[PDB]
């Protein structure tokens, strides 16, 4: 399990150069479907496999 700042750096250590993925908003609907991370990796443990889901392509 990882939480806290121990999270953020770890993600760099999995991303490094590639950066992160962001779902860019364009037309600014006054709404958004926003389940996150500490729900996942700070209540149970998560693998270095699924972290790619957040790293940029």
């Amino acid at each position: 399990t990882l939480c806290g700042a121990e999270l953020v750096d770890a993600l760099q250590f999995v991303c490094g150069d590639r950066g992160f993925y962001f779902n860019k908003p364009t037309g600014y609907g006054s709404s958004s479907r926003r389940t996150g991370i500490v729900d996942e990796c700070c209540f149970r443990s998560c693998d270095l496999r699924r972290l790619e889901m957040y790293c940029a392509p």
Binding site: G19, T26, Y28
Partner: protein, 798 residues
């Protein structure tokens, strides 16, 4: 130039180029996760001056200050906050200061700056002149103060206690505006449609960034008809909102605003979808929706039907209640349970005004429906005879909530028709609202009394609604020097309780400090349905009988001169009654006759009279310490039990100070000085006991001189009797006489006692060799040497 609806600076320093163009940032501004791996080239961006909504900074390694990046940022209105805030900077290394001089006015949120010790110049800049809710800001965790000590290169206004250098860096300073008002570059309140500053005063167009709306270079407080109110900062045409790319998946004109959705029952008119005509939010997935911050709540605005749950908890802040009302009020109906925990600024749930119909379908454990817990400063449920409320199912619960009234729950269970549902546990009574109750029956004190140490209180005998309720009593009390005291719940003087059960019910408090204004009041404890009442009572004051005072202290004294004595002391540690005065007595002291009784001329040595961390206390030490204290205690216990009526003595009555000067005294004499405190109640009580002191008056120096000419005479075998008078007032006591004499130098030295001097009237050295001779005398008083008197001559021939 404007831009919308948001910027996402992330991982790509280069990406910053997206701010090349505009100055009105509609939406938000994210700047996050920028490693300093790329070198800093000072990408200046001057055109930008205002952003509608929040500004976020997170982990941009490689930035030193802010002005370098943002010179012209002046105002951020903050329409949609970011967790109750407007600008937040978090986890920033490299960052030395906030060069944001141009900012003057920020409207809605608060500033949260945290966990960046890499920076200082914080305790300088005043915000209160920018925004209002200073008590909602949050700044700690940056570099400790005693390592910063920064000094400006400007104006100085008290920062809540005192003024200092208010400068946004070592190169700029905090602007301001005098009491003229808007404001201009040089001291003038511009056209009142302004915000921040104006180029030139009093113009509809030259204002740097004008408030309250925007339109076609003009600043209006009310848009024209063809226009509409857009994003709380501008006015628009029909066509523009008709061409907006909603991408919500054209805005609806309503109340002259381009709002995207519509309240209940307001549907896109047939072929006028651009307008809503009159003829419910939440998802089935989560089934619950916590509410902590305005963002977590503003994203709920505009609903009346609700499905899911209402978990609510808020940790701190100002009247968030205002805002939560300004949104949640539209809610009427909820399916699932309602639950509250640890909330602290929820003075009263009044903001859920239009809720009437609760389902409580998906109940909590124990099939619970209405659930509160531990919320401290909640004092009143909105349940009043206006808002009825029909809880369908489930059960209730309350616990620990100390500011509501234990009868409000009763009106609640009334209105909701569940008075035959829950047990004594399911709605606790031991520990809810107990720290402040509403109201109950009054009681009356039968009679008081007072000795010097004890007191017997009698209240009026109470009678309950149903007599088989054992109506016992408690009696709260303490010392009270004042009246700025509550009554409600040891150590640092908090309280002390006592219990008590055909005579009138009274109680006896005992072993009390004399003359201490105790405050007392009784409280009714029941011994048994919610048909309980109890009964509070009145805050009664009582001052216990006076008592004999305690001896003074600090007893010190000296002589600024002969027959003058200065003595300073300490008021008693236990006056025990309004102070009246002190008494001072004194006595001469008979000189030590043994000096008389035993001549010390022959003695080889003569006497003289001087005048006028926390290392934790271990166990073994503490033992003997307590024993010593007990010893002194059992010792002075005797002297404590004595009265005292107010060479002879000579008295005094000093009242004002604790120090006094005494006259009319013989010079250089030993005196002793009894002292007493004396309260104003010793008329029949008796004045205080005694603590003494010693002192010795000042020389007298100047009287050890022989009071005349020293005269000689010759005799048979050469015995020269000398005649010199005794100095009548010796400095204390005269012992002997230094007698120098001789042929040419008075090198030979002679000692002369006081017996022979009283035996003959002088001294006489017998069988002296002839020649020319002269002699001198010095005295030997108590203070010291005498004075080597005049050489007088005598020549027994050869």
């Amino acid at each position: 130039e404007i831009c919308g609806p948001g910027i996402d600076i992330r991982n790509d320093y280069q990406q910053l180029k997206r701010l090349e163009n505009c100055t009105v940032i509609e939406g938000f501004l994210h700047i996050l996760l920028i490693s300093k791996a790329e070198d800093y080239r000072s990408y200046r961006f001057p055109k930008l001056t205002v952003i509608t909504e929040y500004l976020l900074l997170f982990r941009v390694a490689g930035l030193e200050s802010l002005g370098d990046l943002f010179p012209n940022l002046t105002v951020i209105r903050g329409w949609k906050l970011f967790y109750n805030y407007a600008l937040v900077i978090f986890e920033m290394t490299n960052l030395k200061d906030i060069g944001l001089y141009n900012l003057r006015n920020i409207t809605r949120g608060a500033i949260r700056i945290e966990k960046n010790a890499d920076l200082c110049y914080l305790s300088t800049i005043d915000w209160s002149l920018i925004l209002d809710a200073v008590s909602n800001n949050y700044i700690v965790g940056n570099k400790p103060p005693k390592e910063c000590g920064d000094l400006c290169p400007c104006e100085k206004t008290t920062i809540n206690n005192e003024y200092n250098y208010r400068c946004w860096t070592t190169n700029r300073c905090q602007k301001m505006c005098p009491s003229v008002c808007a404001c201009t570059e040089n001291n003038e309140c511009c056209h009142p449609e302004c915000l921040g500053s104006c180029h030139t005063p009093d113009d509809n167009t030259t204002c740097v960034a004008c408030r309250h709306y925007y339109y076609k270079g003009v600043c209006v407080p009310a848009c024209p008809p063809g226009t509409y109110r857009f994003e709380g900062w501008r006015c628009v045409d029909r066509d523009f909102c008709a061409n907006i790319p909603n991408a919500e998946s054209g805005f609806v004109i309503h109340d002259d605003e381009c709002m995207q959705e519509c309240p209940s029952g307001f549907i896109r008119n047939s072929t006028q979808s651009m307008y809503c005509i009159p003829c419910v939010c939440g998802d089935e997935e989560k089934k619950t929706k916590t509410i902590d911050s305005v963002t977590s709540a503003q994203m709920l605005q505009g609903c009346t039907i609700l499905k899911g749950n209402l978990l609510i908890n808020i940790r701190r802040g100002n009247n968030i209640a205002s805002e939560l009302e300004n949104f949640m009020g539209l809610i009427e109906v909820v399916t699932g349970y309602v639950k509250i925990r640890h909330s602290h600024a929820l003075v009263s749930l009044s903001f859920l005004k239009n809720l009437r119909l609760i389902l409580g379908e998906e109940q909590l454990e124990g099939n619970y429906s209405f659930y509160v817990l531990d919320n401290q400063n909640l004092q009143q449920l909105w349940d009043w005879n206006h808002r009825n409320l029909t809880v369908r199912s489930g059960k209730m619960y309350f616990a620990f909530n100390p500011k509501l009234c234990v009868s409000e729950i009763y009106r609640m269970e009334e209105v909701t028709g569940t008075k035959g549902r829950q047990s004594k546990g399911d709605i606790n009574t031991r520990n809810n609202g107990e720290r402040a109750s509403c109201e109950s029956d009054v009681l009356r004190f039968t009679s008081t009394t007072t000795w010097k140490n004890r007191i017997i209180i009698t209240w009026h005998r109470y009678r309950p609604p149903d007599y088989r309720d054992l109506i016992s009593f408690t009696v709260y009390y303490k010392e009270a020097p004042f009246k700025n005291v509550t009554e409600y719940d040891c150590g640092s003087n908090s309280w002390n309780m006592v219990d008590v059960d055909e005579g009138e019910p009274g109680i006896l408090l005992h072993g009390l400090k004399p003359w201490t204004q105790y405050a007392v009041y009784v409280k009714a404890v029941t011994l048994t349905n919610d048909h309980i009442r109890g009964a509070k009572s009145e805050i009664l004051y009582i001052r216990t009988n006076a008592s004999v005072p305690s001896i003074p202290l600090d007893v010190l004294s000296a002589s600024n001169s002969s027959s003058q004595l200065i003595v300073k002391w300490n008021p008693p540690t236990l006056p025990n009654g309004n102070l009246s005065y002190y008494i001072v007595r004194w006595q001469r002291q008979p000189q030590d006759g043994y000096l008389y009784r035993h001549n010390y001329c022959s003695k080889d040595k003569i006497p003289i009279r001087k005048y006028a961390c926390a290392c934790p206390k271990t166990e073994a030490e503490k033992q003997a310490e307590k024993e010593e204290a007990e010893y002194r205690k059992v010792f002075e216990n005797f002297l404590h039990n004595s009265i005292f009526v107010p060479y002879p003595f000579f008295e005094s009555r000093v009242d004002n100070k604790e120090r006094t000067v005494i006259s009319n005294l013989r010079p250089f004499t030993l005196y002793r000085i009894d002292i007493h405190s004396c309260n104003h109640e010793a008329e029949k009580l008796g004045c205080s006991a005694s603590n003494f002191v010693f002192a010795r008056t000042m020389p007298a120096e100047g009287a050890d001189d022989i009071p005349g000419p020293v005269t000689w005479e010759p005799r048979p075998e050469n015995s020269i009797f000398l005649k010199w008078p005794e100095p009548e007032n010796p400095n204390g006591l005269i012992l002997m006489y230094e007698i120098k004499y001789g042929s040419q130098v008075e090198d030979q030295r002679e000692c002369v006692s006081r017996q022979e001097y009283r035996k003959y009237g002088g001294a006489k050295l017998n069988r002296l060799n002839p020649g020319n001779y002269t002699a001198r005398i010095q005295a030997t008083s108590l203070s010291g040497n005498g004075s080597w008197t005049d050489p007088v001559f005598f020549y027994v021939p050869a």
